[PDB]
Structure formats: structure tokens, C-alpha cells
């Protein structure tokens, strides 16, 4: 499962993100840039892998695309 893998690989930035930051005058902005990139991008992935988890439909395929990827997958 990548859900228990990507919860810490996007959890490195945002938890170990503010732990290693230089002491310059851009500390309050780069930490805000690193944390909000970890919040927005990971939740964007989170609400996309949950939509396909436990589905309800199936891909309605064209007739030439019924027998084609049997040789390809």
C-alpha cells in the first residue's frame, strides 16, 4: 500500500521540514512555503486515491478497444 508509504514521504516535508531551515530572514516564508506545499499536494493525492478505492463503475470501452490490450496490458 502506498497510502502508508506516502503519508510519511509527504510527511517528511512539514515535520522534518521546519527542523532543517537556515537562519536567514526568509525563515517565516520558506517554512510557510514548505508546509503549505506538503498540505496542498498530499491532500490532492489523498482525495484522488480514495475516489477509486471501493468503486462503483467500470470503464466503458470502444469495440476495437475490447481485444487490444490483451496483447499489451
Amino acid at each position: 500500500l502506498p497510502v502508508v508509504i506516502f503519508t510519511t514521504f509527504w510527511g517528511l516535508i512539514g515535520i522534518a521540514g521546519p527542523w532543517f531551515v537556515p537562519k536567514g530572514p526568509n525563515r517565516g516564508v520558506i517554512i510557510t512555503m514548505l508546509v503549505a506545499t506538503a498540505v496542498c499536494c498530499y491532500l490532492f493525492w489523498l482525495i484522488a486515491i480514495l475516489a477509486q478505492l471501493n468503486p462503483l463503475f467500470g470503464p466503458q470501452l470502444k469495440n476495437e478497444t475490447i481485444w487490444y490490450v490483451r496483447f499489451l496490458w
Binding site: 530572514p25 526568509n26 517565516g28 516564508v29 510557510t32 512555503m33 503549505a36
Partner: protein, 49 residues
């Protein structure tokens, strides 16, 4: 040789607002201020923007 001196006042006039700004975070700063410039010591949305 006479010095210029700097006296601090204590009025109730509304102070202007100022933002520390690089070359990077300038475009995101004046895209917030195009609608309305914030009050004195308001929470600035531009780092989150």
C-alpha cells in the same frame, strides 16, 4: 557639528502598513493589495497566497 535629533510621538493617527518584500514575493504581495491593502498589524495573506 550640531546634531539632528529624533523624537518619538504618541498620537492616535492611523499608521500606514508596510511589508518586507523580496524580488520573489513581490508579485504575490501586490496581487493581494490590488483589492484592498490591509489594516495595521493585520494577518497578511501573502505568505499563504
Amino acid at each position: 557639528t550640531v546634531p539632528s535629533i529624533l523624537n518619538r510621538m504618541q498620537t492616535n493617527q492611523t499608521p500606514p502598513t508596510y511589508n518586507k518584500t523580496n524580488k520573489f514575493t513581490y508579485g504575490f504581495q501586490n496581487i493581494v493589495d490590488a483589492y484592498g491593502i490591509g489594516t495595521y498589524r493585520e494577518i497578511n495573506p501573502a505568505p499563504y497566497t
